[PDB]
Structure formats: structure tokens, C-alpha cells
Design a protein around this ligand. Structure first.
Ligand SMILES: *SCCN[C@H](O)[C@H](c1ccccc1)N(C)[C@H](O)OC(C)(C)C
Ligand SMILES: *SCCN[C@H](O)[C@H](c1ccccc1)N(C)[C@H](O)OC(C)(C)C
Ligand SMILES: [Mg+2]
Ligand SMILES: [Mg+2]
Ligand SMILES: [Mg+2]
Ligand SMILES: [Mg+2]
Ligand SMILES: [Mg+2]
Ligand SMILES: [Mg+2]
Lengths: 236, 5, 236, 5
């Protein structure tokens, strides 16, 4: 690994610098190097890992959607044949996206998840596993598409089961997990009713627990609750 | 698109 | 070259797709492949080349400025020693930026400029040569810094001489060249008076020529004239 | 920063 010669602490330091410079590919490569040192990640370091790859794959997904939309229009009635270029370039972006997802899933499997025993780390990593299988599912069209979808569902479900047993309903990781699993139901699994039910129950159970929280925790939880509400408003 | 985090 | 097997027309097609997807690194690699086919570039293709590399190096410059600012604060009085990491990472971004500039200058030298005979292509490429030496000058600190600055100045000056002889004062390439050479004077050559004089004379001479233009040409020229005015307002 | 194109 190209980061094998750099100190773990220096990799974390440079990940933070890359974030300030909005250099998310660098940030992700630094955090990949940090994970491959083999030590567990702290709360802050887990955040750096997720932020880096979320921005990298988010840009790839945005680009893939632009190209897939152009490709779909090219295949409509009355459209001029333009050659293989649009499909080729959509495939190029798609392959690069799949590569990033495979990299993240590889870090989770070797060996972040198996060493994560506390609820806050294990739920975090399983949510990530669900998310990156979800991104693979967004571009999947082949024999293994149903298995990709079920891999996302299985990871999300294990994270949900742990989060409900071990975390308060206002915990931001629990809330963000539920937000994303709800989107998985709506956009991937063709289950809009389950998506709406999960978002509403998650919102209502968090609402009832806000009274236990400090001012600062209240602000964190209500921020993600508003995203649940935004999705519900989008969907109803 | 819907919100995710 | 990794684009050697792709058709010139396919490279241009994919550059346009990459632009739509805001994938400017891809866009630049496609246009580099197109230039290396050895044929001259059309007006539109010159635009694709400049847009791609302007966005790539623009992002690098923004990141370099963030890191250089952090580095400067780390070297102030009373700042805690944090190790070599900030300098290392600023150097990494700086080296990547220099690499892009060297690539662009290499394309201009082999062999875009020597085959460019019309004013609109030759002035365009010489402005680019001035711009990318200017970006090298922004990060230069060594023995060759004065020579980098003079390389920018010399390219800008040749472009100015041609543009004044061969183009109307409202020509957008002439206007944009003058805009950037004025910034070179202000920010690189420590000549704010020359920067202001050039921007004002360029603006006034364009103003006097607007009456010759169509509605669409008028809109193009006045757009860049407003940038000259914005800089003058910044500087006075 | 000043405007360039
Ligand atoms: S990196 C984790 C810190 N961020 C939060 O836990 C939460 C989140 C939840 C699940 C997965 C990733 C991130 N953020 C979305 C929200 O925005 O963070 C605050 C605390 C509400 C600001
Ligand atoms: S790619 C060249 C087309 N753009 C214009 O010529 C001008 C420019 C000038 C010099 C170098 C690059 C670009 N643009 C800055 C302006 O904005 O273009 C219009 C025509 C005013 C829109
Ligand atoms: Mg060590
Ligand atoms: Mg594919
Ligand atoms: Mg239920
Ligand atoms: Mg050919
Ligand atoms: Mg250097
Ligand atoms: Mg003069």
C-alpha cells in the first residue's frame, strides 16, 4: 500500500488537512492507509473515513446519473445514433464507482466490522456496509443484482437490530441509519410503504426521547429528525 | 433525490 | 498515451460528456488525447481544452492556497510544532499542480503554438502559455522563479502584440487576455499601476467599439468588460 | 482574488 510508510497519526493529520482543502480523494486514500494500519478507529476517525468516501462516491453517483440520463435519451424513439461513446463513458464512471465501493466494503470486511464490539462502532460500520451495497445496487443490472440488494438489506437489518437494543432512539447514528435504510426501501427495494413507516416511527420515537437530552445533543438529533421529515414530505 | 447521511 | 487507441472524434465527444458530468480531470485527459492526435484544434475544441484544464488547475490552486495558509499560521509565533505533515501535504498538492501546468505547457509547445497561424488560435494559445506559467509562478520560490515570471510575461506580451494588431478591441479573446495579463501585473509582477492602466485602457477601447457589434457579440464583450471593471473596483 | 478567464 502506498501509505504503508506513513505514520498512522500523520495519515489522520493529513486526512483532516485534505478535508479542509476539499480534497476528498486524498482524504479517502489517507484514511484507507490509516485503516490498513490494523488498529481500531476512534469515533472521530470513523467520521473521517465515512466523510471522505461519502464525498468521493457521491461525486461519482452524481456523474453516473448525468451520463445514464444522456444514455437513456439516446435510446429513445427518433434519437440520432451517436455511437458507443455515451455507453462507454457511463461504463467507465460506473466501473470507477464500483471500484470505490469494493474498496470501502473491503476495509469493512478486512477487518473493521469483526473487531467492532461497541454498539456505536458496529452500527456505524454496518450502516456503511449497507450504504455501499446500496450504491452498487443503484448501478446493478446483472445476475447478481438481487444478491447485491439483499447484501445491503442484510447489513442494514443487523445494524437496525443492534441500534434498537443498544442505543437511545435519539442517537444520531441510529437516526442516520434509519434515514438511509428508509431510502433503501423507497429507492432500491420498491417498498415505499416500508420506507414511510420506518421514517415516521423513527421520527416519533426520537421526538419522545428529546426531553432527556442536553441542548447540544438536542441540536444534533433534531437535525437528523428534520431530514426524516423532509423525506416524509417528499413521499406524501 | 431523498436525503441520506 | 492511454488515449492513443481512441478516435479523435470520440475523445471530443467524451470531453463534452465529461463537462456535462463535471468530470474535469476526465475532460482534460480526453482533450490531451485529442491534442496528441496531431491535428490542429477548432475554436470549439480550443475552448474544451482550456475549460478542462482551467477547472483542474483551479481546484488545485484553491487547495494549495488553503494548505499554504495553514502552513503559514503554523510558522507564526507561539504556534505549536505539529511536525512536517502540513509542509509535506502542501508540497504534494504543489507538485501535482506543477505537473498539470507542465502538461499543458507541453501540449502548447508540442505542437499547438507552432502550427497556430490565425490570430484567434495563436493569441488563444499564447494566453494559455502565459496563464500556466503564471500558475507556476504563484507557487515558485527557487532559483528559477524570476525566469518563470518572465516566461509568463513574454507569452502574454506576444499575445498582446498580436491581439492589438489583428483583433478588434471588443474581441473576447483579446479582452480575456488583457484581463489576465492585468492580473499578472497586479499579483505576480508587483506592478499594480500597470495592472490598473491595462484594465482601464482595455475597458475604454472596448467601450468605443461596442457600437459595431450585433446584440449577441455585444453581450459577449460586455460580459468580459464587466470583469475588467470588477477588478478596477477591487483595486481602486 | 481578482477575476481571470
Ligand atoms: S461521522 C458521524 C457524526 N455525524 C452524525 O453521527 C450523523 C451521522 C449519522 C450516521 C452516519 C454518519 C453520520 N450526521 C449525519 C449528523 O449530521 O451529525 C450531527 C451530529 C447531527 C451534526
Ligand atoms: S473558450 C473561449 C470562449 N470564451 C470566450 O472567448 C471568453 C474567453 C476569453 C479568453 C480565454 C478564454 C475564454 N470567455 C471568458 C467569455 O466568458 O466567453 C463569452 C463569449 C463572453 C461567454
Ligand atoms: Mg507507527
Ligand atoms: Mg458495468
Ligand atoms: Mg417495524
Ligand atoms: Mg482516426
Ligand atoms: Mg515544491
Ligand atoms: Mg500600454
Amino acid at each position: 500500500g502506498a501509505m504503508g510508510s506513513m505514520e498512522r497519526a500523520s495519515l489522520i493529520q493529513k486526512a483532516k488537512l485534505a478535508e479542509q482543502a476539499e480534497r476528498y480523494e486524498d482524504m479517502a486514500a489517507f484514511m484507507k492507509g490509516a485503516v490498513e494500519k490494523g488498529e481500531e478507529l476512534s469515533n472521530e476517525e470513523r467520521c473521517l473515513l465515512s466523510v471522505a468516501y461519502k464525498n468521493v462516491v457521491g461525486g461519482q453517483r452524481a456523474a453516473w446519473r448525468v451520463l445514464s440520463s444522456i444514455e437513456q435519451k439516446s435510446n429513445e424513439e427518433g434519437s440520432e445514433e451517436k455511437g458507443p461513446e455515451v455507453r462507454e463513458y457511463r461504463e467507465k464512471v460506473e466501473t470507477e464507482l464500483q471500484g470505490v465501493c469494493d474498496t470501502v466494503l473491503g476495509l469493512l470486511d478486512s477487518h473493521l466490522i469483526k473487531e467492532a464490539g461497541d454498539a456505536e462502532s458496529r452500527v456505524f460500520y454496518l450502516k456503511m456496509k449497507g450504504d455501499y451495497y446500496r450504491y452498487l445496487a443503484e448501478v446493478a443490472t446483472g445476475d447478481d443484482k438481487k444478491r447485491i440488494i439483499d447484501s445491503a438489506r442484510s447489513a442494514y437489518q443487523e445494524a437496525m437490530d443492534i441500534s434498537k437494543k443498544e442505543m437511545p432512539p435519539t442517537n444520531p447514528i441510529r437516526l442516520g441509519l434509519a434515514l438511509n435504510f428508509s431510502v433503501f426501501h423507497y429507492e432500491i427495494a420498491n417498498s415505499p410503504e416500508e420506507a414511510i413507516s420506518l421514517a415516521k416511527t423513527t421520527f416519533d420515537e426520537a421526538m419522545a426521547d428529546l426531553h432527556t437530552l442536553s441542548e447540544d445533543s438536542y441540536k444534533d438529533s433534531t437535525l437528523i429528525m428534520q431530514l426524516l421529515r423532509d423525506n416524509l414530505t417528499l413521499w406524501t | 433525490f431523498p436525503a441520506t447521511v
